[PDB]
Structure 1
């Protein structure tokens, strides 16, 4: 089988194994800070530089993957804690949408909320334009920030959140387990045909954004990942 595996307990600007897009910046503590607190409509994204083959066009097999990462979102004086973080999968040539307004687009979609990607969003602001639930939530996104499915969640400022994601190729099931600071877990699963939605080779990464009045600290602390594609 074809396996791609990597582990990051801290990051560094200059590490070729990672693509930095937008306002992303690396702190002296190794944390990746996605958005710039001073910029309006800030958008920052980080992608694993090596594209991953999530499915074979020859066998029709989709890859199974296991990934876990930890992030932290914190409030900053006088700004609404917005808009959130999104773990996404997109075509290998993905870039921040031209003229991105940040905000509820989470840095992965156009103004209508459309884009080419599959991801798990940790949404901390309710955008009625994208049919967001009234509270903070974790959502499964398929080519749109208008979630296919969401579950109520609570974003605690300064809290380190651990997330585990399992994608089972056979069932095409995407399940997420979120471990909040207080020990409680929040889960959400959704069948998503990766081969029908994305190209053979994709890139994995994170993205976050802010608006003029909505800004907060978005940090990726660590990230381990393993994908296995059966080639037979």
Structure 2
């Protein structure tokens, strides 16, 4: 059984098990800021950021044809100084070693254009903040499942609680092939969930890097932070003590 795991309960200015791409920084205070935030905490336009774990994960194996199970939770904050105008969102993702940032804004760092392409080999769960009709975005802000796509194969409503902290759990069960993303604001006591069957074995290579990508608006005023506070991950490729995972890590 091939296993992979880490917990970051805070992040650090010196974090060599994390590869920063784009504008991503870790502040002195230990917030991973995925996207550009000026000195008075004001988010900034035309930004793009990704942060992925130093090490590859073996997500499926072609000798056995077996597909890994995984669990990730993380805690993040989106702050808008002006909630009427916000863009573009953040995503948790899986992609090949060594994927680089694609186009920004509503492509969220993971894709290059509206269309589907098997070469992306990216799946991500997006937390999508600005409606792009071009991508068949729903009118409400929404959690989204993207598989080589940016046009989510499934979405649901997600009401941003401005400047408030969100706890996420994302979960993938190899035998059901079920993907589930939970989102909770302990402050507002509101909650959101989504699930779909998605076949990791057709869309991802055997090895993958995982992490976060975020973009802000391409038109100033349309602005927000994408600050991540802590991040936990575990994958298992057999041939996932999950109650034990949530509670511990």
In the alignment of these two chains, the number of paired residues is: 228
Q: Which runs of 5+ in 2 are unaligned?
A: 39-43, 240-249
SS of alignment partner, residue 76 of structure 2:
strand
Q: Check whether the contact 2:83–2:162 (CA below 8 A) recurs between aligned residues.
A: no
Whole-angstrom CA distance in 2 between matches of 1:43 and 1:79: 21
**Residue among 144, 150, 158 paired with 1:145:** 150
Q: Which residue of 2 aligns with 1:36?
A: 36
Q: Tell me if structure 1 keeps the 8 A contact 2:13–2:28.
A: no
TM-score by length of 1: 0.93
Alignment-derived partner of residue 58 in structure 1: 63
More strand by proportion, 1 or 2?
1
Deviations 1:117-173 (A, max 9, x none): 101101111111111000100011101111000001111111100011111001111
For structure 1, which segment, 7-16 or 190-199, has the greater mean C-alpha deviation from structure 2 after superposition?
A: 7-16
| One of 218, 227, 230 as aligned partner of 2:226 | 218
Which of 95, 107, 110 in structure 2 is aligned with 1:108? 110
Select the residue among 49, 69, 75 that pairs with 1:70: 75
Which structure 1 residue ranges, 5 or more long, are not aligned?
A: none
Instruction: Output the CA distance in 1 between the equivalents of 2:2 and 2:10.
Output: 26
For 1:80-95, what aligned pairs fall within 5 Å after superposition? Answer: 80-95=85-100
Task: Map 1:188-227 to 2 at 5 A.
Answer: 188-210=194-216, 211-213=218-220, 214-227=222-235
C-alpha separation in 1, matches of 2:82 and 2:13? 27
Which of 145, 160, 163 pairs up with 1:158? Answer: 163
Q: Please give the alpha-carbon distance, in whole angstroms, between the structure 1 residues aligned to 2:25 and 2:84.
A: 20
Matched-pair contact (CA < 8 Å) for 1:126–1:136:
yes
RMSD: 1.6
Deviates more, 1:131-140 or 1:172-181: 172-181
Q: Are the aligned partners of 1:74 and 1:81 in contact in 2 as well (CA < 8 Å)?
A: no
DSSP 3-state at the match of 1:144: coil
CA apart distance, 1:37: 4.1
TM-score by length of 2: 0.87
